Structure 1
């Protein structure tokens, strides 16, 4: 897998972001995680976390996995990186997302994320508190 450029267009919520990719505006859904909806507990915190991470970043990159690149809703499915840091991993390490939606063709970074979840679980962070 390889990272490709994109630019922030706008924050949406904890696990969705509007990015420009290959010149075209697109909503991206972060692979392999589930943040709470904005109206759910830790939802606002998740949205804030991802907004800031993405806003502050000098450089956003997308990384498609091996499978499906767009979901049923037209959202691109990728891992997102902000200055080389995976947003999934950051969210999951803070207990602001669960590992989730792990489908067979598109699960390259499962265990990395699971490892992060375990440490958030142990620290009883946020979702785990």
Structure 2
């Protein structure tokens, strides 16, 4: 896989962000994770974590997997990076997302994320507390 440029338009919630990609606005849903909804426990903390991470970044990048690049809602499906740090992994490592929605052929970073989740579980962080 490879990273491509994107520029933040707006933080949305823990696992969705609006970014401009090849000059067009899109809403991206982060691959391989599930944050709580804003109305659910930790939902606001996940939203604020992702928002801080993308708003503070000097450089956002998007990385598509090998499979489907959009979902049925027309959202982009990608791994997102903020100054080189994967947002999807960072959420999981902080116990603010579960590994979820692991579909065959768009699961290149699964094992990296499962290892973050195990570590967040060991530390009993947030969702795992």
Any runs of at least 4 consecutive aligned residues in structure 1 with deviations exceeding 4 A, and if so which? none
CA offset at residue 38 of structure 1? Answer: 0.1
Could you list the per-position Cα deviations for residues 94-116 of structure 1 after superposition, in whole angstroms to 9, with x for gaps in the alignment?
00000000000100000000000
Aligned length: 129
Matches within 5 A, 1:1-129: 1-129=1-129
TM-score by length of 2: 1.00
Q: Matched residues in 2 for 1:33 and 1:89: separation?
A: 9
Q: Matched residues in 2 for 1:70 and 1:91: separation?
A: 21
CA offset at residue 52 of structure 1? Answer: 0.2
Q: Matched residues in 2 for 1:31 and 1:19: separation?
A: 15
TM-score by length of 1: 1.00
- The alignment partner of 1:69 has SS state of coil
CA offset at residue 57 of structure 1? Answer: 0.3
Could you list the per-position Cα deviations for residues 20-71 of structure 1 after superposition, in whole angstroms to 9, with x for gaps in the alignment?
0000000000000000000000000000000000000000000000000000
| Structure 2: gaps spanning 5 or more residues | none
Q: Matched residues in 2 for 1:64 and 1:33: separation?
A: 15
Q: CA RMSD in A?
A: 0.3
Q: Matched residues in 2 for 1:89 and 1:28: separation?
A: 15
